[PDB]
Design a protein around this ligand. Structure first.
Ligand SMILES: O=c1[nH]c(=O)c2[nH]c(=O)[nH]c2[nH]1
Length: 245
């Protein structure tokens, strides 16, 4: 019942819903690549070179149509990793840079969301990966990557008022997307808010969470609202004097 009859809860929800739409496009598009039954069959049947150019054309089309930084699939049998330009490299369990792939397939989880360094380019990206399965048997992984600098830019444009800031935080407290790109995937929520307020907005149900915190004697309000499709939380920070406008 805090701020219920204020415009603030609806304003945060409108931001939350816009962020879910924009993240929803790569979620959906990456799922389409992994679920593509023609690709599943090509991976299961051993990556016939005769059809490889046409699957690279397909990844290129999906990247451009969906404005992704990169699109990709990898075979769990050969370790071969393909992106929109072709066969890039072979993964290996003994290489720490490939931990993401083996951890994910070992996990069996239906989806992987991960901030990581793109192996082909060295760029910080948000990756979305799904299992590729045939008759129950894992044959690959596929998905797409988004450039972290672009995501920070998108989160920054949702700033509001004089000092209203918005963050996307994994439900463990690590800030995934920060308006200042330097801190995306690197800053803990406690660094931004203080431990009490971080705990406050990260603890709760599916309704708006809130907590007060002080920043050099300036009183602030912290808000939290879960995303429905990701295990992430939208966190907003606004000075108390800005609550109304
Ligand atoms: O978590 C990751 N998912 C990927 O799809 C990918 N691709 C890549 O090069 N590195 C990573 N990391």
């Amino acid at each position: 019942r805090y701020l219920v009859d204020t415009a603030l809860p609806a304003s945060i929800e409108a931001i939350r819903n816009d962020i879910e739409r924009m993240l929803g496009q790569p979620l959906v598009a990456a799922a389409d690549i992994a679920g593509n039954t023609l690709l599943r069959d090509w991976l299961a049947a051993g990556e016939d070179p005769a059809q490889a150019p046409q699957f690279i054309e397909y990844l290129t089309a999906a990247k451009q149509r969906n404005h992704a930084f990169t699109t990709l699939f990898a075979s769990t049998e050969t370790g071969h990793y393909y992106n929109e330009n072709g066969l890039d490299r072979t993964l290996s369990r003994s290489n720490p840079k490939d931990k993401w792939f083996y951890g994910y397939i070992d996990s069996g989880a239906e989806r992987f969301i991960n901030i990581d360094i793109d192996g082909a380019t060295g760029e910080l990206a948000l990756f979305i990966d799904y299992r590729v399965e045939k008759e129950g048997k894992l044959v690959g992984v596929a998905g797409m990557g988004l450039r972290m600098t672009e995501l920070s830019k998108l989160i920054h444009d949702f700033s509001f008022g004089e000092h209203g800031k918005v963050f996307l935080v994994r439900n463990d407290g690590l800030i995934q997307v920060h308006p200042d790109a330097a801190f995306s995937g690197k800053r803990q929520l406690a660094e931004q808010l203080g431990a009490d307020a971080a705990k406050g907005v990260m603890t709760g149900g599916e309704s708006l969470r809130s907590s007060r915190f002080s920043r050099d004697g300036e009183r602030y309000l912290a808000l939290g609202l879960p995303l429905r499709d990701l295990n992430w939380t939208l966190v907003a920070e606004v000075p108390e004097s800005e609550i109304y406008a």
